Design a binder for this molecule. Structure first.
Ligand SMILES: CCCCCCCCCCCCCCCC(=O)SCCNC(=O)CCNC(=O)[C@@H](O)C(C)(C)COP(=O)(O)OP(=O)(O)OC[C@H]1O[C@@H](n2cnc3c(N)ncnc32)[C@H](O)[C@@H]1OP(=O)(O)O
Ligand SMILES: CCCCCCCCCCCCCCCC(=O)SCCNC(=O)CCNC(=O)[C@@H](O)C(C)(C)COP(=O)(O)OP(=O)(O)OC[C@H]1O[C@@H](n2cnc3c(N)ncnc32)[C@H](O)[C@@H]1OP(=O)(O)O
Lengths: 204, 205
């Protein structure tokens, strides 16, 4: 083991946490300078290089965080549960509320200037989609849909939930109908998708 | 009428396409300084306030450029075309993205940007496109069993299914990516699925 590993780790988390803080009001990752991040972390500018070779590597570390937290809880909830929809929506909604900046980061940096970061978010998205596709096969309530069809179906589900993010930033209009409020809308759309699954032949 | 209007409009567009140019490689609108845009536009910083009182206003003008172009083409295609209207509607989007990449990425990206008025202008634009489709669906009358509220939720799903595929239209696809997971085919498959599901859906509780 490397000496003072806990200390190094807390500084790493501090730098990551500093980046998220700076992006809270909608600043893109690509606009952050090393210096802002290291100062907020409470280390000298040179101390950044003990943890990350560049800002790209820091952004890659922010993406990787979701893989061992959020990703497993969606997978977990499929064992227990109608109401698999509500719980899955709730797990997303909860994760967004408690970690807003990070989800906005994931969504926004899909369109950012870093190729590595665009690719890492895509892979994260795909892993989530793959977990669902596999679970839909296991749960076996659409036994007429083969592997290829489930991949397309699972992509639609994940996107349906995730792409609602723009509607979860600001408070809804006073006059917004209750069936168009973010939580209910996702829910109606996922129930519609599940109904649609029953009648779909799959792919040509 | 105001003197030298065409010339003023020419400078307006220059400022606008200058901002677009600066955002070609993923820069957020919020990180643009007035000075960058003006000098890239080839004018004095003070000459910005002739067109826009602030950068927000420049951003709002960037959003307003989609409303009088793209929106009508999507409505236009629904009068003419059994499985045909899907492919044409998808192709309208895909071509619009090809010819106007930076613009659509701006539309997608600034949904999550630092500006509230710009977030709201994009949501409104998005909603008017959704509303057009919801109305056209009612007009076409091929799902007569679905009430107004059901079509709004359904139409919102359709638009999102297409628009939210944008992240897959930036870089080239992986060599080993299956034909059915290619963005154009995937959207097409997902929309055909949605239309099929529309037949058997009773709508909202
Ligand atoms: C800032 C934001 C910018 C983003 C902008 C967003 C833009 C949004 C894009 C716009 C989206 C486009 C809107 C679509 C509008 C339409 O859908 S147009 C279609 C007419 N509208 C309707 O509502 C009617 C839909 N009707 C039906 O599906 C059927 O009721 C009907 C019989 C009328 C027509 O279907 P049809 O294709 O004739 O189906 P069938 O006769 O059953 O069979 C022939 C074809 O259908 C396929 N099929 C049938 N059933 C299935 C199932 N269960 N699974 C898979 N495939 C099925 C067959 O494969 C067959 O193939 P093909 O004929 O080759 O298509
Ligand atoms: C970085 C990116 C981060 C983003 C992360 C994204 C996360 C993605 C979220 C994950 C999505 C959630 C996972 C989904 C997993 C599931 O789908 S769990 C469901 C089990 N799976 C299945 O495949 C079975 C689905 N089966 C069915 O729908 C039916 O075939 C079946 C009968 C088996 C069960 O459905 P059920 O609800 O019992 O329907 P019915 O028995 O027919 O009737 C009872 C209820 O259904 C409603 N109903 C029926 N028919 C309709 C129609 N046509 N329209 C509207 N409603 C209908 C009735 O109203 C009734 O109500 P209720 O019981 O209250 O639902």
């Amino acid at each position: 083991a490397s000496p003072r590993a806990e200390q190094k780790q807390q500084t790493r988390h501090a730098l990551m946490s500093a980046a998220r803080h700076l992006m809270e009001s909608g600043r893109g990752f690509g606009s952050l300078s090393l210096r802002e991040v290291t100062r907020a972390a409470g280390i000298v500018p040179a101390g950044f290089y003990r943890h990350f070779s560049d800002m790209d590597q820091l952004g890659l570390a922010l993406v990787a965080e979701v893989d061992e937290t959020f990703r497993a809880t969606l997978r977990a909830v499929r064992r227990n549960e109608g109401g698999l929809i509500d719980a899955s929506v709730r797990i997303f909604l909860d994760a967004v509320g408690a970690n807003r900046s990070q989800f906005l980061f994931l969504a926004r940096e899909q369109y950012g200037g870093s190729l590595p970061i665009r690719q890492a978010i895509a892979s994260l998205r795909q892993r989530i989609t793959d977990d669902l596709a596999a679970d839909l096969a296991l749960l076996n309530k659409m036994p007429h849909l083969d592997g290829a069809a489930l991949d397309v179906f699972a992509d639609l589900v994940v996107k349906t939930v995730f792409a609602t993010l723009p509607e979860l930033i600001d408070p809804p209009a006073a006059d917004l109908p209750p069936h168009l409020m973010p939580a209910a809308k996702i829910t109606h759309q996922l129930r519609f998708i599940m109904i649609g699954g029953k009648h779909w032949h799959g792919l040509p």
